[PDB]
């Protein structure tokens, strides 16, 4: 009926974690290869995605008990979740007012069209935008935003995971915190937790559609060369 | 005592080749990750080097009878020569007035210091600058500049070459053209050809010192990740 002590400790860690790995000014986007409006956005977007991965890794390392997993599983989880964790955190810059990620502009205002000039079809971009709007409409306290990413990341059924027992464990502990937080700290959170867990499955689907169109993109050398070593590594098949 | 017909044809091809693969305005340097004055120049310089490789490949493909080699040897030659071909072509932007490559500025004016902020020691940069000044003092007609790169590239003793007989052949044919050109078209070219061939061996040495400090640079993942797929591929060990 009230939040635990080991539960505040966890929430504090996760919010600080996200605070140190997400910039609301986006003041590193200048260091990326410029955006261009072939696949003119690919260089820029690949630089953006590569950058984000490094941040996700920063965040992940600060999720409680994550450093305690085997290096192998840590990799298995990053590799599988990475992309979803990004769609998640990107919502923070998504804008329903104009339906586009605004990290600046007109340079850094990414719309569905841009991601097209990077090798993706509208027939597959549509659901990602839909996912963004629904997520944005949930008006999440940052506590929930953070727990959601930390839970999404610890999702037990990732291809390549070994100790799926302890992973469902640290994710269950997190879910407790979330359900407790909404009930206790969120006025009118009756249906929220459910809606949130609903989002996770929207991600599995979005993740899939990506793996497909990225595979096709990564198999053309003229395109793969536009990527970064990290991207190639994280979305690669090596095991 | 006068230039052949099959010899003008060759010179024409090589000059057009260099004309279509080298830009005197350097108007693509804006598309690179910005330069920064750790290893702040590495991102920019890696983008510059990657760009240059693609150009060298463009040039190489237009060298006469190069398309007639096996895909394997073409690779073996690019991999070994690439770096030297770059030091060669860079001279065109090097400036004795200020001893630095000026492709713009203050942004694109690269000095010895910059290449330091990219993972190389002065105790090894010194000879490259020396090589640039000597080369610049030879005041080469572009015909000679081009033949020099086309000869350097066809250098027969590259690690990994198979048909070293036909390669010494197409390079001998080129050398004829060069010696003929200087004697016939260059007033006071008595000692030139020799000085030029002298430069090639300066390159083998500069090439070596690079392979060493790049190996050390490429073995640190925090650094290799700053590179490009092409660089990694071209300076890699795969066979």
């Amino acid at each position: 009926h009230m939040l635990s002590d080991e539960q505040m400790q966890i929430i504090n860690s996760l919010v600080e974690a996200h605070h140190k790995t997400y910039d609301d000014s986006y003041s590193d986007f200048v260091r990326f290869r410029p955006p261009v409006r072939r696949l003119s956005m690919l260089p820029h977007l690949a630089d953006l995605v590569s950058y984000s991965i490094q941040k996700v890794i920063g965040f992940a390392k600060m999720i409680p008990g994550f450093r305690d997993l085997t290096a192998e599983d840590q990799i298995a989880l990053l590799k599988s979740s990475a992309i979803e964790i990004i769609m998640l955190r990107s919502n923070q810059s998504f804008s329903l007012e104009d339906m586009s990620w605004s990290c600046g502009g007109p340079d850094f205002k990414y719309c569905i069209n841009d991601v097209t000039k990077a090798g993706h079809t509208l027939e597959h971009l549509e659901p990602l935008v839909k996912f963004q709007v629904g997520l944005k409409k949930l008006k999440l306290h940052e506590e929930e935003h953070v727990l959601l990413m930390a839970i999404c990341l610890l999702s037990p059924d990732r291809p390549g995971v070994q100790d799926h027992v302890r992973i469902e464990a640290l994710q269950d502990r997190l879910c407790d915190v979330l359900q407790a937080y909404i009930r206790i700290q969120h006025p009118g959170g009756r249906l929220l937790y459910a809606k949130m867990i609903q989002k996770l499955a929207d991600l599995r689907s979005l993740n899939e559609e990506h793996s497909k169109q990225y595979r096709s993109l990564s198999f053309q050398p003229e395109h793969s060369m536009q990527l970064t070593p990290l991207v190639l590594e994280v979305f690669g098949s090596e095991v | 005592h006068m230039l052949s017909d099959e010899q003008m044809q060759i010179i024409n091809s090589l000059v057009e080749a260099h004309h279509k693969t080298y830009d005197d305005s350097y108007s693509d340097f804006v598309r690179f990750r910005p330069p920064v004055r750790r290893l702040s120049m590495l991102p920019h310089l890696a983008d510059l080097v990657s760009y240059s490789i693609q150009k060298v490949i463009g040039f190489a493909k237009m060298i006469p009878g190069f398309r007639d080699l096996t895909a394997e040897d073409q690779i073996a030659l690019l991999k070994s020569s690439a770096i030297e071909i770059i030091m060669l072509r860079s001279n065109q932007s090097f400036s004795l007035e200020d001893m630095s490559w000026s492709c713009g500025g203050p942004d694109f004016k690269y000095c010895i210091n910059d290449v330091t902020k990219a993972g190389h020691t002065l105790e090894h940069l010194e000879p490259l600058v020396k090589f640039q000044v000597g080369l610049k003092k030879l005041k080469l007609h572009e015909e000679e500049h081009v033949l020099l790169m086309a000869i350097c590239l066809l250098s027969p003793d590259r690690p990994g070459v198979q048909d070293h007989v036909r390669i010494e052949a197409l390079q001998d044919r080129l050398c004829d053209v060069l010696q003929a050109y200087i004697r016939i078209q260059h007033p006071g070219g008595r000692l030139l050809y020799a000085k030029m061939i002298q430069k090639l061996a300066d390159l083998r040495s500069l090439n070596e010192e690079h392979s060493k400090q790049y190996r050390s640079l490429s073995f640190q993942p925090e650094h290799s990740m700053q590179l490009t797929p092409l660089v990694l591929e071209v300076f890699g060990s795969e066979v």
């Binding site: 990053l78 | 993942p221 925090e222």
Partner: peptide, 10 residues
């Protein structure tokens, strides 16, 4: 395999 990731995970 996974040179960079290992490194990034201190």
């Amino acid at each position: 395999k996974h040179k960079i990731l290992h490194r990034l995970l201190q």
